[PDB]
Design a protein around this ligand. Structure first.
Ligand SMILES: [Ca+2]
Ligand SMILES: [Ca+2]
Ligand SMILES: [Ca+2]
Lengths: 334, 185, 334, 334
């Protein structure tokens, strides 16, 4: 009888500190942008940097990326809590506006204007078969990270002597016209672990031939969280259909709104004296390293400029038993 | 109180040049749109005219009032910060906006360039300073109106930005209750 | 038909940024402590600093309070999110151990030991009628804030010529013996508003004769959140029954465990470009001041030492229509 | 098992001192009077001082008001208990007797006598629309407070050049004849608070344009009981219909009995040592000021004589949501 505080019977025991340390809180970062794609020939193609973490949670448009600390403030506090995990990520292309430079000439006096009819389209390509494993900027151009969210990144897909029309090689190609419904693209992440640091121009976690989701080198004589199972994202791209003119190719320009959303889960500090700031340094659990794992693989950045983008999708020809849910396993290292 | 935007007509100055001989005309296709923004989160608390321009009150109902929303070094695209953004094209149904006022009191004077009554961080609905040693009607509860705005999507051209011009009809309606004088002598 | 993106019909409109800014996340800070109450005569009384915010979320025991930044780490991040609110607050006294100095003498050779039988008790007093509005330390002693959670704060309640036995004036007096069940005390806060700053040795919000829950001076020609309705906390106290001896009073010493819990709600940053760090300074809503309100009333602290503690409970003789749930109202100031 | 006094289990706790401090005791003061209204022309009008507290609980008639301490003894002890509240208040006019001076002349030999037939009447006017906000005595006369309960107070309601017949402007006008049933008038007070002092020629509590129910100036940095909602009393009046004669106006004189009743609630002292006379001075709760509030607004008295009477009724054109029950709210002051 009683709560146990009596001399005999059951032991009075203190309240549970786990329950509040395991509660998963779930937030998101939503951002809108206007994208203007101009002067894109049918060979060259816009690379959607949609597999890089910085695309969703940091707003790089125009002058913003030049100014400092453009991260969304929900993300700045995800570094205040002890663990965060990116979970689902996605974006939306909406309200396409095509314009034409066909009336434009060096003499001027006539500017670009929307296409005379709505038959033209912009091709949204998803490369499932990974025709392009690794994508580089065009010879003259370069990819700024400050420019990331307005989609200027132009790749020229070229065989040895052959200029590749991107829509022809890629698997899913959506021909998206003026008036069509918005194009919604999403990726679900199921991670068995959490991140304690900032992404820092890392790809949003993927398990692929190109990259793995967990970023820490596992170390000897204990168990470490290890990536497994091949979850990855398909290399999205934007291109225009080749249309021949009296001279060269038809000039198609596109506008659309870019709505990106990344949904973070985060988790808070240990209850009790363990969570006191002064004593948490040396009372921090050493098994954080077990479930808290940093970021796996970084985009290649020299200066502020992206060197290349790797995609590596969950390829359909991997055994379906490998392609399943959980992206990490807790496995030892000798 | 409320208003309606209806029968949008977009035109383009793209064919217009200083040499002339070609005037503006309706957009070649109906894909362009005018963005109607309602700021729910109050990104903009207080709005000022552009540096060169000014806002006449005599001009109020034809909507010329132009604000330039700018961060420190950053020019803000209005549609990106605001909460509800309607992209309203040619042929779309009219846009109806309304605000219901529930006041516990009445007004005896003219509004006289007053905001239609609101309870907010910026303003309160009742205008008289209450005075000592008795009971006075006091604003309460935060009823306010969202900062509606109109803007066009950025569209790059060979030079600068695409020139979008808009026409629409503005139907406003304000519904007054009124009350008459005391009976008797 | 469609999502609205077509030329005619309904307006395609962007995603809602409110839903994620209104989501209320709910955490707590739990801390345990051992309290040793010694040399407390029947006139003097231990003041439970249970109505001060710093009691629950900052751990002041022994050497900890001398060391820097002893706040719990869940609270340090409540300053990272834009709004937090304290909601429920409470504490538990458990596993009482009484000891006696009766065998102790200046000659020594015999130390204190647990009471020969379990008949003695420690009195837990809740002052409902507010016999003591404002409580001061004893003439010689002083109340450190670094000492807060181990309960050393001793008040001597005295009439003009009369030494008050605390248990006699106070309303609820629990005589709590060795083996009795733990004593659980809780206070629910219903606030209509949120806090954007640190409590900073503020009383956990109360509406009373002594103090109000909202801390900002309201300013002219607009509406401001105003405290209302008298929610307050009863002045908890600890004392021992007077027991006469051959010389003076029986020496009762007490041990018990102090488990405090404070449950915070918090709320995150605005979605969209409004929530970008660089532009959030000047795009911060000016109506934050409407629902975000700081801390109302501070304990009186000179140096590190508490000058006095005010209690001000929700008194039972206030009309029950005043005593109800919501602690704030949004009311204008002229 | 047991009452808790055992070593283990539940805490034996002392009896509740709230229950007896919250018990509301309810009394009343009833007084009868004979009113003689003579020489009242149709322009001038009797002001019923029925909204002043002293009307009901202090008996001012003839020589009584000249003698000292004419308060009813139930009221003298309402100052012995710690709190009292006026609640309902009302009065009755009964058994009207009209007489005529028409047969009276300066030569005499014929005195006044009851009207030849019962057709004449005395007009009881209730001003709902507040035609008269503030009422003054006639130029020559003055209003003694010692004369209050026999109704001599004569106002002359006059426009700029126009003598107002009172019955014409006022809303409810009862033409009350000889033999008509008694006229009963009542006002219910719902206060959220109590009074600790004497009324002291205060209006019985009202919330109006002219006056408020709570009399203490609220003070900084805590919560204070504040009047709210517009409960007030209509300016009752007595007048006679204009009846022209061969010379001037018909002389109507009235008698009736005035039965007034005021129903007080009162509340007693704190139980326990807190309620001991010697220690109650410094153990008095400081939150009395929260629910104990004095008197709001005073009639204007120079010497013993009333300067003016303010009425301020619950006007019907205030929103019905404002006009509801509770006359006070517990609201903070910064
Ligand atoms: Ca046990
Ligand atoms: Ca449409
Ligand atoms: Ca027991």
């Amino acid at each position: 009888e009683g709560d146990g505080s009596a001399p005999g019977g059951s032991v009075w025991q203190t309240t549970d500190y786990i329950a509040l340390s395991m509660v998963v809180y779930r937030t998101a970062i939503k951002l809108r942008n206007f994208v203007n794609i101009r002067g894109l020939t049918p060979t060259e193609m816009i690379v959607i940097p949609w597999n890089v973490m910085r695309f969703y949670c940091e707003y790089n448009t125009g002058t913003y990326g030049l100014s400092g600390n453009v991260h969304h403030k929900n993300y700045s506090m995800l570094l205040a809590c002890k663990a965060h995990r990116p979970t689902k990520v996605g974006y939306t292309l909406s309200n396409l506006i095509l314009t034409s430079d066909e009336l434009v000439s060096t003499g001027g006096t006539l500017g670009t204007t929307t296409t005379f009819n709505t038959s033209p389209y912009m091709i949204h390509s998803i490369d499932d078969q990974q025709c392009l494993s690794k994508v580089y900027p065009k010879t003259d151009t370069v990819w700024p990270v400050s420019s990331m969210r307005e989609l200027d990144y132009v790749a020229s897909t070229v065989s040895g002597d052959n200029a590749i029309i991107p829509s022809t090689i890629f698997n899913k190609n959506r021909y998206w016209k003026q008036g069509d419904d918005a194009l919604h693209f999403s990726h679900d992440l199921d991670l068995g672990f959490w991140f304690g640091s900032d992404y820092g121009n890392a790809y949003v976690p993927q398990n692929n031939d190109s990259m793995n989701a967990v970023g820490t080198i596992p170390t000897s004589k204990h168990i470490n969280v290890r990536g497994v199972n091949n979850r990855g994202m398909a290399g999205h791209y934007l291109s225009f259909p080749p249309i021949r003119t009296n001279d060269g190719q038809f000039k198609l320009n596109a506008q659309f709104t870019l709505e990106t959303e990344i949904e973070f889960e985060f988790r808070l500090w240990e209850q009790g004296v363990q969570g006191i700031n002064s004593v948490h340094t040396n009372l921090n659990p050493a098994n954080d390293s077990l479930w808290i794992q940093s970021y796996g693989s970084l985009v290649s950045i020299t200066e502020s400029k992206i060197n290349n983008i790797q995609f590596g999708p969950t390829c359909p020809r991997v055994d379906a038993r490998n392609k399943g849910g959980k992206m990490s396993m807790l496995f030892d290292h000798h």
